[PDB]
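Q: What does the assembled structure look like for these inputs?
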Amino acid sequence: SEFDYELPPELIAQEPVEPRDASRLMVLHRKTQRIEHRIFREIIEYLEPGDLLVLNVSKVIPARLYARKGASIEILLIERLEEGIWKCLVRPGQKVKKGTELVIDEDLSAVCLGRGEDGTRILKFQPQDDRLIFEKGTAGLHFTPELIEKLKKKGVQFAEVVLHVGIHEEFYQVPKETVRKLRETRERGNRIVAVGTTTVRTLETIARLPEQEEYVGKTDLFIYPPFEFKLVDALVTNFHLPRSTLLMLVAAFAGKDFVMEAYREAVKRRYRFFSFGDAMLIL
Amino acid sequence: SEFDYELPPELIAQEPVEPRDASRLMVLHRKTQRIEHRIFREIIEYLEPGDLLVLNVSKVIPARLYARKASIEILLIERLEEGIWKCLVRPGQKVKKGTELVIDEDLSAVCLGRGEDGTRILKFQPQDDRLIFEKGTAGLHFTPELIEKLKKKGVQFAEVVLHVHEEFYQVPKETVRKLRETRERGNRIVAVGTTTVRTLETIARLPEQEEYVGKTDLFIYPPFEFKLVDALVTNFHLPRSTLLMLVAAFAGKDFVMEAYREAVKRRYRFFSFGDAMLIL
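A:
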């Protein structure tokens, strides 16, 4: 493989450094081809006021319910708006519109209050009781609260994307506030800095869809070199394993020969790899 | 490398399964060369009453102190009672029964002698642990529930300790006793983890004592005679790792490499949060 490299097994970290921002940070400057060897908390020296750090948050879908209208409809809870009012993924959704009533039990029903621009259904449960409803149904970890506070003091902004995990089945969500911030950051001429490869795949997926105010969906996107990044200007990520698809994505972002040179230097300098290891910033 | 195998990166686990004993368990029977594919909680089906599971517990040394009699380093190892500790003392030849050592104006110690494991027993003055402290994964597959069932079946448990650059093992009196008793009954000493293996096979090569504390330099690779360990529970190790060499010594190299190739084929999860192997 073009993405194979020799990784001494002892460099795969079993536990993280403490504090988390005392991990190593290799910085790659793509246009100049400069590589630097830093510590994570020094990431602030690369960020300017107005840059946007986008983080992914992975959430387990807190209930899956089957209902009847009498078609048999699946309901997946995505986002709570209020006790007993949730944005939901409803399948088959073509059936469900404002006013549609859905019965789960003798003890639980729901009325559709509307449809999101993202394709979800806003459902009000009867009764509005989340406990009943539930009954019926790592790159970011280098950032410490102290670092996040320093960054915000410098004028760096934050946004989040979400990965909703069903259980196999994963839905991304890019909420309205994140869509607005991405657009504002671009307008200001600042950088969208993705934190983690999950964030990258979500953002490059929505960059290729028609414009919406908010997005929810599934992504199949496979990123492999050469690839044009439409939304992501910079990337914080871990050191990935030989032949991994994550290494292929980062190679597309940084340039294959450059990232392979960087990984050979990381092994030589005894960086730690994988989920509890060190980090890379690609600018 | 004789210890290389192709491991798809996606098989290296980032997180453990829950509950812990729902991970896969591959079982290797050395004499018959049989290989089975089980779940961890089923390990009880391979253990009999009187078998001994030996687990390693890692403990950070709870105080490191410098004293003068001049210049002495003191590492706390084991509390006998309040203010009386088995200690590692460096340099040790200079500390004998009756040696006094001052840490501060606030804290002194006297050496009461040496135990059978060679550690120095220090009585501190005052006898006050808080003051003294001021001045200075294979086993995770087991759940509390499984442990309870194993104990109800008559399987016994013992501990070895690793006191932590710079690591000292301890095999306490109660473990030495159970090792011997187990052997006397003709039951199996079952090592949980390669750390346990290294400790037990170290002390097996030493003059007999009732308790041990020391540093191990033992490096296990094929062929090796296991003098204490009758069976092993361990994770799936990475290509070319020294841990894989150790397990190849325990299982036999060709047998273990066949097992690992089958593990990949069946998409077992590898490394510290992955599945497990029992070698009998």
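The CA atoms of residues 84 and 222 of chain B lie 43 Å apart.
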